[PDB]
Swiss-Prot record, chains A, B:
Lineage of the organism: Eukaryota, Metazoa, Chordata, Craniata, Vertebrata
Regions of this protein lying in the Extracellular compartment: 105-110, 257-259, 339-340
Organism of derivation: Homo sapiens (Human)
Protein's name in the database: Solute carrier family 53 member 1
Outcome when changing residue 8 to G: Decreases phosphate efflux
Gene for this chain: XPR1
Residue intervals annotated with topology Cytoplasmic: 64-76, 151-155, 225, 288-306
Portion of the full sequence shown: 228 to 625 of 696
């Protein structure tokens, strides 16, 4: 059981965050920088932390040995309450920064100082040299991130692949960071960054899928099993093909060279291909569903740890829907595409992708515990 | 150990209460009825509940068998966390009502209904017929209150005398209620109730002291022990003398009878008398300190359970100051001695009196557990 003081802190942070969110909404309805884009990354990170705490709680309840799957220390483990506490505290900081930006309480301090301080403090907390807060977990996360970003140089384990998938679900943060860099470089044609797109933008969008693709190639080289690793690599490269076709279509829309429609057709066909590939991989391989052996459970795996099959069915439906939504969101953010509705579409879709990745984490850990689908254990 | 969900709720309520207090302070700084009088009772009740939770925690930590002193059922005991939860929820409701009054969010709904309903809920929370929200403790409290108010009829146990003392420390609530009744009756001469003082106000001021005095007389009759019960009865009657002399002086000021200075001197004499009487009784009898037996602890009883004697000395000093403060508060509130600043002085003093009674409960329960100071046990 978690410490009583930890539960008290979790409750206090949740309450403060709720009241701050209510105040923010009231100020927005009643009462220079792209605040939405600046704060989208922080909001998505807080949501991801909260959903990860929920994932840990559900894994513990279901009996899934997520500690064994992630190779975490059996003696020392991070309770879901700790994740909830961190998410709540970061939510309070995010809401306070947003309120300060909206109100500008202190004139001398410019508005952007609040978001820069928020993000810098979050980074420092992650890389805090001292052992004040969750030092073991933070160091483990830093090592895992370093291994993941260096996908080919280090052998791939379950934790590395899982973190690479999480970063794939969090490409919106990288997109927002790149957009902010462009905004500072050029804004500070006014909206040149949003008006025009470049190859660097597509590369930033595709970096997580590139990391996953290189991880799959490394696993193929180590194990020499062509089928699964190469199929996953194709699944991840569908994203590159789609994004590059969208970029070409947008570029030739800006200047008509008689190839814009070809690029549009390529983008749409590869968008459908990527959506189908990712959805099939998630439903059949990551979750191990639709197997023939299952006789009692229809469209599900023979053994299901979670009590309800309705969970699995709703998960399949929310997986297909949000796979299509995430493909659309990546299309929207990578290129101009829809010029005015792109930002709103991406903002609405990113939390939905975070929720989809949360459900995917649930069911992937379930399948990994029941069967060695990832083949990361002897 | 309290349930984890209870701790989470306590934290949530504390955080929401803190943010609501911050919002109230901001609104007051940036921005028909005497809101202070209306809301002081609720604020004092919430503060008393929080301090009571702290008292329970301290009694449990120090080994004081407060359960046996209060004759509560050993199997079922209300933990400090539950009291904190109740106080936080009540404070949240109080702050919401005050904010609604300040902002008048609903034009159709009159302002004056916002406080009433709040207090109404509190009443319905206390008398809730359904077996919910600590129904057993609520029913025990209701029975204790009924017995205390009908003090002569029933024999005085430790719980009855303790609750009567708590009421003595919370007479400001009754005074505010009576003032509100007068304000509705007459104002709804400007400030007629505030400008003039009447006998009924003095009678209301003496209700808790009357209850304690009659309880002491009943105990004297039951046990036939003259010294303690009669000395305590005189201690409580000093308050009647002070209040009546202050009221007479105020009335004489209102209409010159040529005896105003005589009543001023009499009120001052009885005010010093009451302050000294109450302070001596609390320091020597209720707390049992300054015992001759003690040789290691100076000015303290031989056996001390609390870790620090500095706690005892600080409590002594705070009681010395706050007893005189409380007598001053009673004198001003019961009459029109300080019409310009009487309300502000009473508002500042009442929380201080509540804190003084909190410390007094601490040390009185400690002494009662150590020795049968109240002679409630054989
Ligand atoms: C694109 C922008 C950046 C994207 C975000 C990047 C990363 C965050 C995502 C996921 C974190 C990993 C979740 C754990 C999964 C394993 C299951 C489990 O719950 O295991 C936990 C591992 O705890 C963790 O890893 C920490 C959880 C996350 C805490 C968040 C820290 C602050 C982050 C601030 C923002 C950082 C970015 C800067 C802003 C731009 C068990 O803990 P333990 O103490 O047993 O650890 C083992 C330690 N031994 C082996 C030595 C005993
Ligand atoms: C204008 C008048 C204002 C109202 C009067 C003032 C204060 C009321 C509140 C508390 C006074 C009682 C404190 C007793 C503490 C003893 C030590 C202990 O903490 O032990 C507790 C005492 O439990 C209590 O009594 C409950 C404590 C208070 C909780 C809050 C109740 C709601 C109050 C709302 C007031 C609304 C008024 C509106 C305006 C009129 C043991 O708990 P148990 O669950 O074992 O209870 C015993 C149950 N058996 C005997 C069956 C096992
Ligand atoms: C609204 C629709 C489209 C979303 C899809 C259904 C959602 C609500 C389903 C999908 C997977 C489900 C989760 C699957 C597993 C668990 C673990 C269990 O111990 C508690 C419930 C919990 C946490 C479920 C809650 C409901 C859930 C999140
Ligand atoms: C006004 C100034 C001079 C003195 C103020 C002293 C106050 C703060 C002192 C008086 C009695 C003290 C309490 C006496 C006993 C306990 C029980 C212990 O387990 C925790 C601390 C606690 C709860 C103390 C906290 C501090 C306290 C409330």
């Amino acid at each position: 059981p978690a410490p009583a003081w930890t539960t008290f802190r979790v409750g206090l942070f949740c309450g403060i965050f709720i009241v701050l969110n209510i105040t923010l909404v009231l100020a927005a309805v009643f009462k220079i920088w792209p605040l939405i884009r600046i704060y989208r990354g922080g909001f998505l990170l807080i949501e991801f932390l909260f959903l990860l705490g929920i994932n840990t709680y559900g894994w513990r309840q279901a009996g899934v040995n997520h500690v064994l799957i992630f190779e975490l220390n059996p003696r020392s483990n991070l309770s879901h309450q700790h994740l909830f506490e961190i998410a709540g505290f970061l939510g309070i900081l995010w809401c306070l920064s947003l309120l300060a930006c909206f109100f500008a309480p202190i004139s001398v301090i410019p508005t952007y100082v609040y978001p820069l301080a928020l993000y810098g403090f979050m980074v420092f907390f992650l890389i805090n040299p001292t052992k004040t807060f969750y030092y073991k977990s933070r160091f483990w996360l830093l090592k895992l991130l370093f291994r993941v970003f260096t996908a080919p140089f280090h052998k791939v384990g379950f934790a590395d692949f899982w973190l690479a998938d999480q970063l794939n679900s969090l490409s919106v943060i990288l997109m927002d960071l790149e957009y902010m860099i462009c905004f500072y470089s050029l804004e500070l044609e006014s909206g040149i960054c949003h008006k025009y797109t470049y190859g660097v933008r597509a590369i930033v969008q595709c970096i997580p899928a590139w990391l996953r693709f290189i991880q799959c190639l490394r696993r193929y080289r180590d194990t020499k099993r062509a089928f699964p690793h190469l199929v996953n690599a194709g699944k991840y490269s569908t994203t590159f093909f789609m994004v590059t076709f969208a970029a070409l279509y947008s570029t030739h829309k800006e200047r008509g060279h008689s190839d814009t429609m070809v690029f549009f057709y390529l983008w749409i066909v590869f968008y459908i291909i990527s959506s189908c590939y990712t959805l099939i991989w998630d439903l059949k391989m990551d979750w191990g569903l639709f197997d023939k052996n299952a006789g009692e459970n229809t469209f599900l795996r023979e053994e299901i740890v979670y009590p309800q099959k309705a969970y699995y069915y709703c998960a399949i439906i929310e997986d297909v829907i949000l796979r299509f939504a995430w493909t659309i969101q990546i299309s929207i953010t990578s290129t101009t595409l829809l010029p005015h509705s792109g930002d709103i579409i991406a903002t609405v879709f990113a939390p939905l992708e975070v929720f989809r990745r949360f459900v995917w984490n649930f069911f992937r850990l379930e399948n990994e515990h029941l069967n060695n689908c990832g083949e990361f254990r002897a």
